Amino acid sequence: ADAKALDELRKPKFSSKYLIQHVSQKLIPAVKEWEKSYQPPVIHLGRVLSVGDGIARVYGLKSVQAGELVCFDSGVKGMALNLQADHVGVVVFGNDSVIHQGDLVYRTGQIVNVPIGPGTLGRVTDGLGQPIDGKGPLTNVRSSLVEVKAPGIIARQSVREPLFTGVKAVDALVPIGRGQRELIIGDRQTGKTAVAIDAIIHQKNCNEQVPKAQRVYCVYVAVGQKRSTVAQLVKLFTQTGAMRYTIMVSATASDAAPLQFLAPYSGCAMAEYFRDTGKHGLIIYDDLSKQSVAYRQMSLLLRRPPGREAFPGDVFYLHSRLLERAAKLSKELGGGSLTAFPVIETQAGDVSAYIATNVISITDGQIFLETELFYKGIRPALNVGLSVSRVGSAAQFPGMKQVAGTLKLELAQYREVAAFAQFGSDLDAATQYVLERGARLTEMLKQKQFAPIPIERQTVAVYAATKGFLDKVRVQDIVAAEEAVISQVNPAVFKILKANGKITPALDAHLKAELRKVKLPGA
Amino acid sequence: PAIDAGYVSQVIGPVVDVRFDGELPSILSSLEVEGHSVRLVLEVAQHMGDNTVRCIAMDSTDGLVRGQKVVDTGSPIKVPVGRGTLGRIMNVIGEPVDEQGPIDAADIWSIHREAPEFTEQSTEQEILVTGIKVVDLLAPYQRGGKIGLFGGAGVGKTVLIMELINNVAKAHGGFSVFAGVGERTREGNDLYREMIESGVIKLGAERGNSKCTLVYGQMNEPPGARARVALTGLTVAEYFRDIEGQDVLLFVDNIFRFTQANSEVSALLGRIPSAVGYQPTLATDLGGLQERITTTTKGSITSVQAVYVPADDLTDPAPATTFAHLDATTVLSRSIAELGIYPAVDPLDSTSRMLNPNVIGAEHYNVARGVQKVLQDYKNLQDIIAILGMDELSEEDKLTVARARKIQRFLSQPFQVAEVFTGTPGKYVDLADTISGFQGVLTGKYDDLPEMAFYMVGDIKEVKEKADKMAKDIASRKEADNKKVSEELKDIPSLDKLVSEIKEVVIEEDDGLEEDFKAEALSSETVVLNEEGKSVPLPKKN
Ligand SMILES: Nc1ncnc2c1ncn2[C@@H]1O[C@H](COP(=O)(O)OP(=O)(O)OP(=O)(O)O)[C@@H](O)[C@H]1O
Ligand SMILES: Nc1ncnc2c1ncn2[C@@H]1O[C@H](COP(=O)(O)OP(=O)(O)O)[C@@H](O)[C@H]1O
Ligand SMILES: [Mg+2]
Ligand SMILES: [Mg+2]
């Protein structure tokens, strides 16, 4: 049955037509009496052969592009993943219980896209761009693809601009450049979103003070999160005023796994509107470890082979092609930026997991959130020894760079001499200076939630702590002394530090002087 | 025009099947796709059996239809090679991605060839001085060797491979090729801009005086492009070795990415998965690539390859296969990095073929074996030092722990590429100063100094320079009370006077979002295409 033997059946070899002409006068009368039992034939439309596990196998669709939005007659969208010779397998962006075998599949003619623009600012959308906030459709908007390739080497520049988080431990010790990716990695319940929420609230305070080109438009993507937490977050952004600059992409835990897999690409495409028009974006992928679990579900249901942790093997490319789109563009492309904050949930502090080590080898730094520093009340529980930001360093606030070089230094010795004194029986009194300055600086760096601090009021509080001016206070009233420093010091010294950028020696003298007339609560 | 022009049969991610009605292309031949938005070439991987070839796309397949015309080029992927490719950045298929014009090609070489034969091999071992203490002592590199840096996501393989570009690749008088296989794009641009400011890459009419050519297949590329861009980097390095006949420095960042990209593809080629979900052909795919990166009798390639280990697991199928392919393996550890020791080289897991008494001399060899004997016997003690503490040790064993903590800190050093984020300037340490320095700590000449005098210093002259600074500051901690530059009149204007010198910034209040934006009309209904390809709203049934 070789192929040379079957193409001989192309040319006719009967020389006898006594039932070629017999059924040709009886076929059309036979077909005509079974017409209400024929579904109409399908060539450029599609018909569902088989649906189940959130994957539909579609007969027909002769001209679908690979990776194209297809629309079922139930109104549900899909994406043509694999075009095969006999069918096209689509993945259903929604609930597969409303798709039946025999349903018509329509072609939209466009590769999978979301509405991007200025009119998507302020809105709560799903993983496909359809708004779920109930306040209408998206107007003043246009469609852009969710799988855009990242800009190349020549379309980029180095990060220069300092993108203040408003978190004291972050902007002092691991500062964030404006086109940078920074992993927020930690255990469950360690203030992962707290660091990313305080970054978003802080841009609302800064956007109303910068001249329209240094404004940061945030995007928050929730993958696998409960709807109530997402709804409690849109209420917090609406009441802080941060919703004016924020897009909220939401694919909750009840949503389909292709809607949670696609939601960071949908949100990255909306944040790429500001990168590609010279503005500045900030995107948070909250639980990118939940987006890999949703993609692991689609790969196992597509019967792709398991991997190291049963992940598809292309789960690195899932996150690498996502986070490479967070870039600082060059001057001929507008100079826009996109800053990513992926969030990875860690099980029992184990950072040697598969998805954790993947995103570490993609992103530019990490913000490690220790679950033992979080239980002791040190919040944000920044693991200072492990948290890295080298791309954002030498791009930070110049005045903070003077006062935090000794802050990282006096914390580097503090971890050395707390490792040497695991118990109190030996007292050197030259390391007790480090135990009294290290416990001073730890209390300075911890701050409470949903109140981000400007960078000029954050430089002075570390100026008042790495130097003297707080050795009077024992360890307890330092949080009260910091608000005693910030309120009692003349607010005209915060304008000089902000406008000059750094601590001039004219201001170094004045701020040593104003820090001596502060009524410290520890007396 | 019809035959030798096939059509796209089926698309499964990066894998495209093309059916040719006659004259199938050979395996490894490249196939252009007509009518794609970008240039999509496909490398033929398999003959499927029914006039169908199975191909690997070197770009994205989003936009492929199952009738698309596919033209065979009759040859593999052929990239520009020669002295005109220097100072340029290429992708997997040889296109310039640096916007500097077309590449002045001396020749057009296909990226697929066999290894040099057994008669072509060169057996010569001379040392490569890197200026790194732990490298030049314990696992010294070979000047025509294969060098592997083994790392676990953040332990410092890229900083180490960037320091070897700083130390070795300037004193080395040949050409360099940097193959970036599946790494960060920012690093590529950072390395591209730090070579232009160093004069390693010269732009404009001075392009011929460049010493490095870059081939970049970074981690935004599809898995077909990252599985073949290492072969594009060898082909540029093999032209300088075979035809030009000179010594090449080949730096491959994340060599494991080539193995990982073939593992993303092997699932879709219909292959039963191997151990850990890897492709069954893991040892021969990596083998057929690594056996090309050698020194022949006509030229030399000194290859440094960063190898990423997946879950800090050195027994994983892709790090474990690479170990047999290297003359020197520098294993970087995570626990060494958490003690603050940089470069985070495991001294008892790093190994060099170069560390032989005949090859490096008996004085160098006995210091390295004595350093490893102290660090191993200290590792045998750490189970008791954790539980019982150092109080229960014999004082013969306390001298072991005291010397091993000293040589552990002394193996670390500051890098000239790491001073941009550490602040400490970098120290190139000559080979004679590492052998002299570590021999003194082994015999006992420096038991006087503390542990932290050895931390982040160049040579043993600087341990004594730092033991004084540490000693000197145990006296001086104060006396900054009065007689300042910070009093009232001397250099200081009024504070309200400084507020008037602030230039006021006009905030434009309107956010500038609708400047040039065109807004397409989103319909109230889902717009779809009917059987005739016409834009029709979605019909009303379900
Ligand atoms: N700096 C802080 N001070 C006090 N409470 C905080 C601080 N940061 C976060 N919290 C609180 O601690 C709890 C956990 O923080 P958060 O929810 O941000 O962590 P997470 O990493 O997102 O956890 P999950 O895995 O539950 O999403 C919350 O109740 C939060 O309000
Ligand atoms: N030699 C070094 N000196 C100082 N810090 C280093 C060194 N190597 C790595 N690091 C720190 O660890 C991080 C990892 O370095 P890098 O080589 O980029 O990572 P990887 O080895 O995962 O590719 C750096 O960003 C830096 O913070
Ligand atoms: Mg959370
Ligand atoms: Mg790296």
Pocket test for ligand 2, best of A360, A361, A388 (most atoms within 8 A of CB): A388
Question: Whole domain around residue A417: which residue ranges?
Answer: 397-523
CATH code at position A235: 3.40.50.300
Looking at A362, A396, A430, the residue that finishes a domain is A396
Q: Same structural domain for residues A96 and A118?
A: no
What CATH number did the domain enclosing A64 receive? 2.40.30.20
Residue pair A351/A185 in contact (Cβ under 8 Å)? The answer is yes
Question: Atom 16 (ligand 2): residue with closest C-alpha?
Answer: B156
Q: Do B498 and A507 touch (CB under 8 A)?
A: yes
Question: What dihedral angle (degrees, nearest 10) is formed by the CA atoms of B492, B493, B498, B500?
Answer: -170
- Asked whether residue A256 falls in the same domain as residue A153, the answer is yes
Does the annotation place B518 within a ligand binding site? Answer: no
A427 and A375 housed in the same domain: no
CA distance A244 to A502: 31
Counting runs of H as helices and runs of E as strands, what totals does chain A give?
Answer: 17, 16
Domain edge (last residue) among A87, A110, A133: A110
Assigned domain for A6 exists: no
CA separation for the pair B79, B469 (Å, rounded): 56
Note whether B89 contacts A67, CB cutoff 8 Å: no
Q: Which of B154, B179, B174 is nearest to B304 (CA)?
A: B179
Cβ of A328 closer than 6 Å to ligand 1, yes or no, is no
Q: Are residues A329 and A417 in the same domain?
A: no
Closest CA to B31 of B69, B64, B72, B68: B72
Q: Are A136 and A204 within one domain?
A: yes
Strand partners, A89: A57, A82
Q: How far apart are CA A485 and CA A498, in angstroms?
A: 17
Peptide bond into B116 cis (omega under 30): no
Does residue A13 fall inside a structural domain? no
Residues A128, A91 share a domain: no
Beta-carbon separation of B491 and A509 below 8 A: yes
Is there a contact between B413 and B456 (Cβ–Cβ < 8 Å)? yes
Same fold, B78-353 and B355-479: no
Q: Do residues A207 and A265 share a domain? A: yes
Cα–Cα distance for residue pair A77/A93, rounded to 1 Å: 5
d(CA A228, CA A434): 45
Determine the distance separating the centroid of ligand 1 and the alpha carbon of A193, expressed in angstroms. 7
Which tokens in the block code for residue A142? 């246009």
In this complex, is the C-beta atom of B270 within 8 Å of any C-beta atom belonging to chain A? no
C-alpha gyration radius of chain A: 30
Selecting from A324, A361, A391 the residue whose C-beta is nearest the C-beta of B154 gives: A361
Domain B1-76, CATH class in plain words: mainly beta
Please count the structural domains in chain A.
Answer: 3
Technique behind the model: cryo-EM
Mark whether A344 and A454 lie in a shared domain: no
- Alpha carbons B321 and B315: distance in angstroms, whole number: 9
CB B244 within 8 Å of CB B209:
no
Residue A3 within a domain:
no
Map out the domains of chain B as residue ranges. Answer: 1-76, 78-353, 355-479
The answer on A401 and A391 residing in a single domain is no
CA A462 – ligand 1 centroid, Å? 24
Does residue A87 fall inside a structural domain?
yes
CATH of the domain spanning B78-353: 3.40.50.300
CA distance A244 to A233: 14
Q: A421: distance to nearest CA of chain B, Å? A: 12
Task: Give me the CATH topology for the region B355-479.
Answer: 1.10.1140
Out of A110, A139, A167, a domain closes at A110
Chain A residues lying within 8 Å of B509, measured CB to CB: 212
Nearest to B105 by CA among B33, B213, B30, B178: B213
* Residue B39 to residue B60: CA distance in whole angstroms: 10
Characterize B136-166 residue by residue with b for buried, 16 or more Cβ atoms within 10 angstroms of its Cβ, and e for exposed. bbbbbbbbbbbbbbbbbbbbbbbbbbbbbbb
Is B34 marked within a binding site?
no
Contacts with A64 from chain B: Cβ below 8 Å: 65-66
Domain identity same for A352 and A240: yes
- Specify if A439 maps to a domain: yes
- DSSP per residue over A455-495, as a string? HHHHHHHHHHHHSSSSSSS-SSTHHHHHHHHHHHS-THHHH
Catalytic residue among A142, A160, A304, A390: A390
By DSSP bridging, strand A77-83 and strand A142-145 are unpaired
Q: What is the dihedral of CA A346, A351, A352, A357, to 10 degrees?
A: 90
How far CA B402 is from CA of A351, A421, B449, B452, in Å, comes to 31, 18, 11, 12
**Chain A window 243-302: which residues touch B at a Cβ cutoff of 8 Å?**
277, 279
| Helix, strand and coil in chain B, % to nearest 5 | 35, 20, 50
Say whether both A124 and A57 belong to one domain: no
Sign of the C-alpha dihedral computed for residues B180, B182, B185 and B187 taken in this order: negative
Contact A251, A93 (CB under 8 A): no
Six token digits for residue A396? 């930070």
Judged by CB atoms within 8 Å, which residues 428-487 of B form the interface with A?
Answer: 474, 484-487
Q: What is the largest CA-CA distance in chain A?
A: 117
Helices (H), A42-154: none
